[PDB]
Amino acid sequence: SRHVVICGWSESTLECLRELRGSEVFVLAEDENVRKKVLRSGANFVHGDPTRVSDLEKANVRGARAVIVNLESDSETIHCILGIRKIDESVRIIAEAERYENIEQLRMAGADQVISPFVISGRLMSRSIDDGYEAMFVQDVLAEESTRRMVEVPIPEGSKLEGVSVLDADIHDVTGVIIIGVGRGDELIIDPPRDYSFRAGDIILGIGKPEEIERLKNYISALV
Amino acid sequence: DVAKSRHVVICGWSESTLECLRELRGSEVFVLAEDENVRKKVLRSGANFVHGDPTRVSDLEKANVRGARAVIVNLESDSETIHCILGIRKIDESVRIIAEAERYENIEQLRMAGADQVISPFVISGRLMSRSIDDGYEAMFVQDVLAEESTRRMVEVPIPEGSKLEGVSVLDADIHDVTGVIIIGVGRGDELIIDPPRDYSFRAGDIILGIGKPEEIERLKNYISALVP
Numbered sequence: 460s461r462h463v464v465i466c467g468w469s470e471s472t473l474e475c476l477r478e479l480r481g482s483e484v485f486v487l488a489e490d491e492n493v494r495k496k497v498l499r500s501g502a503n504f505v506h507g508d509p510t511r512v513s514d515l516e517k518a519n520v521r522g523a524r525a526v527i528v529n530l531e532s533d534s535e536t537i538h539c540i541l542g543i544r545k546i547d548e549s550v551r552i553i554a555e556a557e558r559y560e561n562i563e564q565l566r567m568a569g570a571d572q573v574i575s576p577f578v579i580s581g582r583l584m585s586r587s588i589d590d591g592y593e594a595m596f597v598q599d600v601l602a603e604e605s606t607r608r609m610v611e612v613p614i615p616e617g618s619k620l621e622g623v624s625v626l627d628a629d630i631h632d633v634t635g636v637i638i639i640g641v642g643r644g645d646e647l648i649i650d651p652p653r654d655y656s657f658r659a660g661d662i663i664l665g666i667g668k669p670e671e672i673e674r675l676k677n678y679i680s681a682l683v
Numbered sequence: 684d685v686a687k688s689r690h691v692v693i694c695g696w697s698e699s700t701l702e703c704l705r706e707l708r709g710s711e712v713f714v715l716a717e718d719e720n721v722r723k724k725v726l727r728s729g730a731n732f733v734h735g736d737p738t739r740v741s742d743l744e745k746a747n748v749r750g751a752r753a754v755i756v757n758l759e760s761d762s763e764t765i766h767c768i769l770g771i772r773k774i775d776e777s778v779r780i781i782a783e784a785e786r787y788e789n790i791e792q793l794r795m796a797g798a799d800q801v802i803s804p805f806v807i808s809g810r811l812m813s814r815s816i817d818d819g820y821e822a823m824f825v826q827d828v829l830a831e832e833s834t835r836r837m838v839e840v841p842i843p844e845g846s847k848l849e850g851v852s853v854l855d856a857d858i859h860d861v862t863g864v865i866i867i868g869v870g871r872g873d874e875l876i877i878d879p880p881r882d883y884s885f886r887a888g889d890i891i892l893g894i895g896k897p898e899e900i901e902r903l904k905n906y907i908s909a910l911v912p
Protein backbone atom coordinates (compact mmCIF):
# COMPACT_ATOMS: atom_id res chain seq x y z
CA SER A 460 0.00 0.00 0.00
CA ARG A 461 1.04 3.57 0.76
CA HIS A 462 4.24 4.32 2.69
CA VAL A 463 4.37 4.51 6.49
CA VAL A 464 6.06 7.42 8.29
CA ILE A 465 7.73 6.94 11.68
CA CYS A 466 8.38 10.08 13.72
CA GLY A 467 11.22 9.94 16.18
CA TRP A 468 13.54 7.10 17.07
CA SER A 469 13.54 4.81 20.12
CA GLU A 470 14.33 1.15 20.74
CA SER A 471 10.69 0.52 19.84
CA THR A 472 11.20 1.83 16.29
CA LEU A 473 14.06 -0.57 15.67
CA GLU A 474 11.79 -3.50 16.49
CA CYS A 475 8.94 -1.84 14.58
CA LEU A 476 11.10 -1.42 11.44
CA ARG A 477 12.11 -5.07 11.66
CA GLU A 478 8.48 -6.20 11.27
CA LEU A 479 7.84 -3.69 8.48
CA ARG A 480 10.64 -4.98 6.21
CA GLY A 481 9.24 -5.10 2.69
CA SER A 482 7.05 -2.03 3.14
CA GLU A 483 7.95 1.52 2.28
CA VAL A 484 8.84 3.22 5.54
CA PHE A 485 10.19 6.72 6.12
CA VAL A 486 11.80 7.54 9.43
CA LEU A 487 11.79 11.22 10.31
CA ALA A 488 14.22 12.00 13.12
CA GLU A 489 16.79 14.64 13.85
CA ASP A 490 19.49 12.30 15.14
CA GLU A 491 21.97 11.69 12.31
CA ASN A 492 23.69 8.86 14.21
CA VAL A 493 20.59 6.80 13.49
CA ARG A 494 20.68 7.14 9.68
CA LYS A 495 22.79 3.99 9.19
CA LYS A 496 20.55 1.78 11.37
CA VAL A 497 17.50 3.08 9.50
CA LEU A 498 18.98 2.17 6.11
CA ARG A 499 20.16 -1.21 7.46
CA SER A 500 16.58 -2.01 8.44
CA GLY A 501 15.36 -1.40 4.91
CA ALA A 502 13.72 1.97 5.60
CA ASN A 503 14.39 5.48 4.29
CA PHE A 504 15.80 8.16 6.60
CA VAL A 505 14.58 11.74 6.51
CA HIS A 506 16.50 14.22 8.65
CA GLY A 507 14.30 16.75 10.40
CA ASP A 508 12.18 17.82 13.36
CA PRO A 509 8.92 15.90 13.57
CA THR A 510 7.37 18.77 15.58
CA ARG A 511 7.96 21.03 12.57
CA VAL A 512 5.27 21.09 9.90
CA SER A 513 7.69 21.64 7.00
CA ASP A 514 9.60 18.45 8.00
CA LEU A 515 6.41 16.36 8.25
CA GLU A 516 5.65 17.52 4.70
CA LYS A 517 9.14 16.44 3.63
CA ALA A 518 8.23 12.97 4.86
CA ASN A 519 5.02 12.99 2.79
CA VAL A 520 2.77 12.49 5.77
CA ARG A 521 -0.25 13.55 3.70
CA GLY A 522 0.17 10.47 1.48
CA ALA A 523 0.95 7.94 4.24
CA ARG A 524 -1.28 4.99 5.16
CA ALA A 525 -0.29 5.68 8.80
CA VAL A 526 2.03 7.70 10.97
CA ILE A 527 3.70 6.19 14.04
CA VAL A 528 4.85 8.73 16.59
CA ASN A 529 7.36 8.13 19.32
CA LEU A 530 9.50 11.06 20.37
CA GLU A 531 11.65 11.30 23.49
CA SER A 532 8.82 12.62 25.68
CA ASP A 533 5.04 12.72 25.69
CA SER A 534 4.87 16.55 25.31
CA GLU A 535 7.00 16.29 22.17
CA THR A 536 4.89 13.42 20.89
CA ILE A 537 1.81 15.59 21.39
CA HIS A 538 3.50 18.51 19.66
CA CYS A 539 4.20 16.22 16.68
CA ILE A 540 0.61 14.92 16.53
CA LEU A 541 -0.68 18.51 16.47
CA GLY A 542 1.64 19.20 13.53
CA ILE A 543 0.38 16.15 11.63
CA ARG A 544 -3.25 17.15 12.17
CA LYS A 545 -2.55 20.60 10.75
CA ILE A 546 -1.45 18.81 7.57
CA ASP A 547 -3.73 15.79 7.42
CA GLU A 548 -6.86 15.41 9.59
CA SER A 549 -7.76 11.85 8.55
CA VAL A 550 -4.45 9.98 8.45
CA ARG A 551 -4.23 7.19 11.03
CA ILE A 552 -1.87 8.15 13.84
CA ILE A 553 -0.37 5.55 16.20
CA ALA A 554 1.53 6.95 19.19
CA GLU A 555 3.69 5.58 21.98
CA ALA A 556 2.91 6.93 25.41
CA GLU A 557 5.65 7.18 28.03
CA ARG A 558 3.30 7.92 30.92
CA TYR A 559 -0.16 6.55 31.59
CA GLU A 560 -1.51 9.94 32.67
CA ASN A 561 -0.83 11.40 29.22
CA ILE A 562 -2.82 8.92 27.12
CA GLU A 563 -5.96 11.08 26.94
CA GLN A 564 -3.89 14.05 25.78
CA LEU A 565 -2.28 11.95 23.04
CA ARG A 566 -5.79 11.09 21.86
CA MET A 567 -7.02 14.67 22.19
CA ALA A 568 -4.15 15.90 20.07
CA GLY A 569 -5.25 13.47 17.36
CA ALA A 570 -3.86 9.96 17.98
CA ASP A 571 -6.22 7.23 16.77
CA GLN A 572 -4.37 4.73 18.87
CA VAL A 573 -2.03 4.90 21.85
CA ILE A 574 0.37 2.16 22.86
CA SER A 575 1.88 2.20 26.34
CA PRO A 576 4.80 -0.19 26.47
CA PHE A 577 5.70 0.62 30.07
CA VAL A 578 2.15 0.04 31.30
CA ILE A 579 2.15 -3.34 29.55
CA SER A 580 5.62 -4.05 30.87
CA GLY A 581 4.88 -3.07 34.47
CA ARG A 582 1.71 -5.14 34.48
CA LEU A 583 3.42 -8.22 33.03
CA MET A 584 6.25 -7.98 35.58
CA SER A 585 3.84 -7.76 38.54
CA ARG A 586 2.00 -10.79 37.11
CA SER A 587 5.27 -12.77 36.78
CA ILE A 588 6.00 -13.03 40.49
CA ASP A 589 5.23 -16.75 40.80
CA ASP A 590 5.28 -17.92 37.17
CA GLY A 591 5.62 -16.32 33.76
CA TYR A 592 2.80 -17.81 31.71
CA GLU A 593 0.95 -14.56 31.01
CA ALA A 594 4.16 -12.86 29.89
CA MET A 595 5.12 -15.92 27.89
CA PHE A 596 1.74 -15.78 26.20
CA VAL A 597 1.95 -12.13 25.19
CA GLN A 598 5.50 -12.39 23.94
CA ASP A 599 4.98 -15.67 22.05
CA VAL A 600 1.82 -14.74 20.10
CA LEU A 601 3.49 -11.51 18.89
CA ALA A 602 6.63 -13.31 17.67
CA GLU A 603 6.93 -14.50 14.05
CA GLU A 604 8.79 -17.72 14.85
CA SER A 605 5.93 -18.98 16.99
CA THR A 606 3.97 -21.98 15.72
CA ARG A 607 0.73 -20.53 17.06
CA ARG A 608 0.05 -16.95 16.07
CA MET A 609 -2.44 -14.20 16.68
CA VAL A 610 -4.18 -13.16 13.47
CA GLU A 611 -7.00 -10.95 12.27
CA VAL A 612 -9.45 -12.47 9.84
CA PRO A 613 -12.10 -10.17 8.32
CA ILE A 614 -15.59 -11.51 7.70
CA PRO A 615 -16.32 -10.84 4.00
CA GLU A 616 -19.57 -9.87 2.33
CA GLY A 617 -21.76 -12.91 1.75
CA SER A 618 -19.88 -14.98 4.32
CA LYS A 619 -21.37 -18.34 5.37
CA LEU A 620 -21.07 -16.92 8.90
CA GLU A 621 -23.12 -13.80 8.29
CA GLY A 622 -26.04 -13.81 10.71
CA VAL A 623 -24.61 -16.85 12.51
CA SER A 624 -23.92 -16.82 16.26
CA VAL A 625 -20.61 -17.54 17.97
CA LEU A 626 -22.13 -20.72 19.51
CA ASP A 627 -23.51 -22.09 16.22
CA ALA A 628 -20.37 -21.08 14.29
CA ASP A 629 -18.40 -23.52 16.46
CA ILE A 630 -15.18 -22.02 15.10
CA HIS A 631 -12.65 -23.61 17.48
CA ASP A 632 -13.89 -27.21 16.94
CA VAL A 633 -14.36 -26.73 13.17
CA THR A 634 -11.14 -24.88 12.37
CA GLY A 635 -8.84 -25.31 15.38
CA VAL A 636 -8.64 -21.54 15.77
CA ILE A 637 -9.36 -19.98 19.18
CA ILE A 638 -11.54 -16.85 18.91
CA ILE A 639 -10.17 -14.47 21.53
CA GLY A 640 -12.12 -11.50 20.17
CA VAL A 641 -14.19 -9.86 17.47
CA GLY A 642 -13.48 -6.27 16.48
CA ARG A 643 -15.34 -3.66 14.42
CA GLY A 644 -14.72 0.04 13.94
CA ASP A 645 -12.86 1.01 17.06
CA GLU A 646 -14.52 -1.53 19.32
CA LEU A 647 -13.22 -4.88 20.47
CA ILE A 648 -15.25 -7.53 22.23
CA ILE A 649 -12.93 -9.96 24.00
CA ASP A 650 -14.29 -13.52 24.41
CA PRO A 651 -17.60 -12.75 22.68
CA PRO A 652 -20.78 -14.25 24.21
CA ARG A 653 -22.39 -17.28 22.59
CA ASP A 654 -25.26 -15.22 21.12
CA TYR A 655 -23.13 -12.59 19.42
CA SER A 656 -24.05 -12.71 15.75
CA PHE A 657 -21.35 -12.21 13.08
CA ARG A 658 -21.69 -9.32 10.61
CA ALA A 659 -19.85 -8.75 7.33
CA GLY A 660 -17.02 -6.39 8.21
CA ASP A 661 -16.41 -7.91 11.66
CA ILE A 662 -12.74 -8.65 12.34
CA ILE A 663 -12.13 -12.01 14.01
CA LEU A 664 -9.19 -11.99 16.38
CA GLY A 665 -7.90 -15.53 16.65
CA ILE A 666 -5.03 -17.76 17.68
CA GLY A 667 -4.03 -20.82 15.69
CA LYS A 668 -1.60 -22.77 13.53
CA PRO A 669 -1.15 -21.62 9.88
CA GLU A 670 -3.29 -24.50 8.54
CA GLU A 671 -5.95 -23.78 11.14
CA ILE A 672 -6.01 -20.18 9.91
CA GLU A 673 -6.60 -21.33 6.33
CA ARG A 674 -9.47 -23.53 7.43
CA LEU A 675 -10.93 -20.46 9.14
CA LYS A 676 -10.62 -18.32 5.97
CA ASN A 677 -12.33 -21.04 3.91
CA TYR A 678 -15.03 -21.56 6.54
CA ILE A 679 -15.96 -17.90 6.51
CA SER A 680 -15.70 -17.22 2.77
CA ALA A 681 -18.84 -16.64 0.70
CA LEU A 682 -20.53 -19.74 -0.78
CA VAL A 683 -19.21 -20.76 -4.20
CA ASP B 684 -4.89 -21.32 56.96
CA VAL B 685 -3.43 -18.72 54.61
CA ALA B 686 0.31 -18.32 55.14
CA LYS B 687 1.38 -14.71 54.52
CA SER B 688 3.03 -14.19 51.14
CA ARG B 689 6.74 -13.37 51.10
CA HIS B 690 7.95 -9.90 50.22
CA VAL B 691 8.89 -8.80 46.69
CA VAL B 692 12.06 -6.86 45.89
CA ILE B 693 12.34 -4.36 43.03
CA CYS B 694 15.80 -3.23 41.93
CA GLY B 695 16.09 0.11 40.21
CA TRP B 696 13.50 2.45 38.83
CA SER B 697 12.16 2.69 35.26
CA GLU B 698 8.81 3.90 33.88
CA SER B 699 7.64 0.28 34.15
CA THR B 700 8.13 0.42 37.91
CA LEU B 701 5.29 2.80 38.66
CA GLU B 702 2.74 0.51 37.01
CA CYS B 703 4.30 -2.57 38.52
CA LEU B 704 4.03 -1.09 42.04
CA ARG B 705 0.42 -0.08 41.37
CA GLU B 706 -0.44 -3.75 40.74
CA LEU B 707 1.47 -4.88 43.82
CA ARG B 708 -0.64 -2.78 46.20
CA GLY B 709 -1.51 -4.98 49.16
CA SER B 710 1.72 -6.95 49.11
CA GLU B 711 5.03 -6.25 50.83
CA VAL B 712 7.42 -4.61 48.38
CA PHE B 713 10.92 -3.22 48.79
CA VAL B 714 12.37 -0.93 46.13
CA LEU B 715 16.16 -0.54 45.98
CA ALA B 716 17.45 2.37 43.95
CA GLU B 717 20.08 5.04 44.39
CA ASP B 718 17.85 7.88 43.12
CA GLU B 719 16.39 9.78 46.11
CA ASN B 720 13.87 11.57 43.83
CA VAL B 721 11.90 8.37 43.63
CA ARG B 722 11.46 7.90 47.43
CA LYS B 723 8.17 9.82 47.50
CA LYS B 724 6.87 7.88 44.47
CA VAL B 725 7.62 4.56 46.19
CA LEU B 726 5.88 5.49 49.47
CA ARG B 727 2.86 6.91 47.62
CA SER B 728 2.31 3.47 46.05
CA GLY B 729 2.52 1.69 49.39
CA ALA B 730 5.98 0.19 48.96
CA ASN B 731 9.09 0.63 51.11
CA PHE B 732 12.15 2.49 49.80
CA VAL B 733 15.73 1.35 50.33
CA HIS B 734 18.46 3.74 49.22
CA GLY B 735 21.42 1.88 47.69
CA ASP B 736 23.27 0.35 44.73
CA PRO B 737 21.49 -2.72 43.25
CA THR B 738 24.79 -3.91 41.78
CA ARG B 739 26.24 -3.94 45.28
CA VAL B 740 25.73 -7.22 47.15
CA SER B 741 25.54 -5.58 50.58
CA ASP B 742 22.76 -3.25 49.41
CA LEU B 743 20.91 -6.18 47.86
CA GLU B 744 21.31 -7.88 51.24
CA LYS B 745 19.93 -4.75 52.89
CA ALA B 746 16.91 -4.80 50.57
CA ASN B 747 16.06 -8.31 51.76
CA VAL B 748 16.80 -10.13 48.49
CA ARG B 749 17.47 -13.29 50.52
CA GLY B 750 14.30 -15.38 50.89
CA ALA B 751 12.25 -13.06 48.66
CA ARG B 752 9.16 -14.25 46.78
CA ALA B 753 10.69 -12.73 43.65
CA VAL B 754 13.17 -10.10 42.60
CA ILE B 755 12.25 -7.70 39.76
CA VAL B 756 15.19 -6.02 38.05
CA ASN B 757 14.93 -2.93 35.87
CA LEU B 758 18.10 -0.83 35.79
CA GLU B 759 19.05 1.87 33.26
CA SER B 760 21.03 -0.50 30.99
CA ASP B 761 21.29 -4.22 30.22
CA SER B 762 24.91 -4.38 31.44
CA GLU B 763 23.86 -2.94 34.80
CA THR B 764 20.86 -5.29 34.93
CA ILE B 765 23.26 -8.20 34.40
CA HIS B 766 25.57 -6.88 37.13
CA CYS B 767 22.59 -6.76 39.51
CA ILE B 768 21.42 -10.31 38.68
CA LEU B 769 24.95 -11.66 39.34
CA GLY B 770 24.80 -9.98 42.75
CA ILE B 771 21.42 -11.55 43.49
CA ARG B 772 22.68 -15.03 42.55
CA LYS B 773 25.59 -14.74 45.00
CA ILE B 774 22.99 -14.15 47.70
CA ASP B 775 20.20 -16.48 46.62
CA GLU B 776 20.67 -19.04 43.85
CA SER B 777 17.04 -20.08 43.81
CA VAL B 778 15.02 -16.86 44.09
CA ARG B 779 12.89 -16.11 41.03
CA ILE B 780 14.37 -13.22 39.04
CA ILE B 781 12.37 -11.18 36.49
CA ALA B 782 14.34 -8.73 34.39
CA GLU B 783 13.59 -5.95 31.99
CA ALA B 784 15.71 -5.92 28.85
CA GLU B 785 16.45 -2.65 27.00
CA ARG B 786 17.81 -4.23 23.85
CA TYR B 787 16.76 -7.49 22.23
CA GLU B 788 20.30 -8.77 21.60
CA ASN B 789 20.94 -8.84 25.35
CA ILE B 790 18.08 -11.18 26.31
CA GLU B 791 20.12 -14.38 26.28
CA GLN B 792 22.87 -12.74 28.33
CA LEU B 793 20.34 -11.74 30.99
CA ARG B 794 19.07 -15.35 31.05
CA MET B 795 22.69 -16.55 31.33
CA ALA B 796 23.37 -14.27 34.33
CA GLY B 797 20.44 -15.83 36.20
CA ALA B 798 17.15 -14.27 35.08
CA ASP B 799 14.26 -16.75 35.01
CA GLN B 800 12.07 -14.49 32.94
CA VAL B 801 12.93 -11.61 30.66
CA ILE B 802 10.44 -8.94 29.60
CA SER B 803 11.22 -6.59 26.73
CA PRO B 804 8.91 -3.57 26.64
CA PHE B 805 10.41 -2.03 23.46
CA VAL B 806 10.07 -5.31 21.62
CA ILE B 807 6.43 -5.64 22.66
CA SER B 808 5.86 -2.00 21.78
CA GLY B 809 7.58 -2.15 18.39
CA ARG B 810 5.62 -5.24 17.49
CA LEU B 811 2.24 -3.88 18.58
CA MET B 812 2.92 -0.66 16.69
CA SER B 813 3.84 -2.52 13.53
CA ARG B 814 0.60 -4.48 13.86
CA SER B 815 -1.48 -1.35 14.30
CA ILE B 816 -0.99 0.21 10.86
CA ASP B 817 -4.54 -0.53 9.67
CA ASP B 818 -6.48 -1.21 12.86
CA GLY B 819 -5.65 -1.60 16.57
CA TYR B 820 -7.39 -4.83 17.69
CA GLU B 821 -4.24 -6.77 18.66
CA ALA B 822 -2.92 -3.85 20.71
CA MET B 823 -6.34 -3.32 22.25
CA PHE B 824 -6.45 -7.00 23.26
CA VAL B 825 -3.03 -7.07 24.94
CA GLN B 826 -3.71 -3.86 26.83
CA ASP B 827 -7.34 -4.75 27.62
CA VAL B 828 -6.75 -8.29 28.97
CA LEU B 829 -4.15 -6.93 31.39
CA ALA B 830 -6.41 -4.28 32.97
CA GLU B 831 -8.31 -4.94 36.20
CA GLU B 832 -11.38 -2.93 35.11
CA SER B 833 -12.09 -5.21 32.12
CA THR B 834 -15.19 -7.42 32.21
CA ARG B 835 -13.13 -10.16 30.59
CA ARG B 836 -9.81 -11.01 32.22
CA MET B 837 -6.79 -13.26 31.77
CA VAL B 838 -6.25 -15.53 34.72
CA GLU B 839 -4.23 -18.50 35.88
CA VAL B 840 -6.06 -21.40 37.49
CA PRO B 841 -4.14 -24.37 38.95
CA ILE B 842 -5.36 -27.97 38.56
CA PRO B 843 -5.64 -29.17 42.17
CA GLU B 844 -4.52 -32.57 43.41
CA GLY B 845 -7.32 -35.10 42.91
CA SER B 846 -8.98 -32.96 40.24
CA LYS B 847 -11.95 -34.17 38.16
CA LEU B 848 -9.86 -33.28 35.10
CA GLU B 849 -6.89 -35.46 36.05
CA GLY B 850 -6.44 -37.83 33.14
CA VAL B 851 -9.09 -35.96 31.18
CA SER B 852 -8.33 -34.73 27.67
CA VAL B 853 -8.94 -31.16 26.55
CA LEU B 854 -11.64 -32.40 24.15
CA ASP B 855 -13.43 -34.40 26.85
CA ALA B 856 -12.97 -31.66 29.44
CA ASP B 857 -15.08 -29.32 27.22
CA ILE B 858 -14.03 -26.39 29.43
CA HIS B 859 -15.26 -23.52 27.27
CA ASP B 860 -18.79 -24.93 26.80
CA VAL B 861 -19.00 -26.08 30.44
CA THR B 862 -17.58 -23.00 32.20
CA GLY B 863 -17.45 -20.19 29.63
CA VAL B 864 -13.68 -19.74 30.04
CA ILE B 865 -11.47 -19.69 26.94
CA ILE B 866 -8.44 -21.94 27.42
CA ILE B 867 -5.58 -20.11 25.75
CA GLY B 868 -2.81 -22.22 27.28
CA VAL B 869 -1.57 -24.69 29.84
CA GLY B 870 1.60 -24.13 31.83
CA ARG B 871 3.90 -26.12 34.06
CA GLY B 872 7.45 -25.42 35.13
CA ASP B 873 9.10 -22.91 32.79
CA GLU B 874 6.94 -24.21 29.83
CA LEU B 875 3.72 -22.98 28.19
CA ILE B 876 1.58 -24.76 25.61
CA ILE B 877 -0.53 -22.23 23.80
CA ASP B 878 -3.84 -23.59 22.52
CA PRO B 879 -3.34 -27.23 23.62
CA PRO B 880 -4.34 -30.09 21.26
CA ARG B 881 -7.65 -31.96 21.65
CA ASP B 882 -5.85 -35.00 23.05
CA TYR B 883 -3.72 -33.16 25.62
CA SER B 884 -4.48 -34.67 29.02
CA PHE B 885 -4.71 -32.49 32.14
CA ARG B 886 -2.49 -33.25 35.13
CA ALA B 887 -2.49 -32.21 38.76
CA GLY B 888 -0.17 -29.18 38.92
CA ASP B 889 -1.07 -27.90 35.43
CA ILE B 890 -1.82 -24.17 35.27
CA ILE B 891 -4.75 -23.23 33.07
CA LEU B 892 -4.25 -19.90 31.37
CA GLY B 893 -7.71 -18.62 30.62
CA ILE B 894 -9.83 -15.65 29.66
CA GLY B 895 -13.35 -15.19 31.12
CA LYS B 896 -15.85 -13.26 33.30
CA PRO B 897 -15.38 -13.56 37.09
CA GLU B 898 -18.39 -15.89 37.36
CA GLU B 899 -17.12 -18.05 34.51
CA ILE B 900 -13.81 -18.26 36.37
CA GLU B 901 -15.57 -19.46 39.52
CA ARG B 902 -17.33 -22.13 37.44
CA LEU B 903 -13.92 -23.28 36.16
CA LYS B 904 -12.61 -23.60 39.74
CA ASN B 905 -15.58 -25.76 40.80
CA TYR B 906 -15.45 -27.94 37.66
CA ILE B 907 -11.80 -28.80 38.22
CA SER B 908 -11.93 -29.12 42.01
CA ALA B 909 -10.91 -32.36 43.69
CA LEU B 910 -13.38 -35.21 43.66
CA VAL B 911 -12.50 -35.84 47.28
CA PRO B 912 -11.97 -32.61 49.33
Ligand SMILES: [Ca+2]
Nearest residue numbers: 635636667878
Ligand atom coordinates in the same frame (compact mmCIF):
# COMPACT_ATOMS: atom_id res chain seq x y z
CA1 LIG C 1 -5.79 -25.21 17.82
Ligand SMILES: [Ca+2]
Nearest residue numbers: 650863864895
Ligand atom coordinates in the same frame (compact mmCIF):
# COMPACT_ATOMS: atom_id res chain seq x y z
CA1 LIG D 1 -16.61 -16.36 28.33
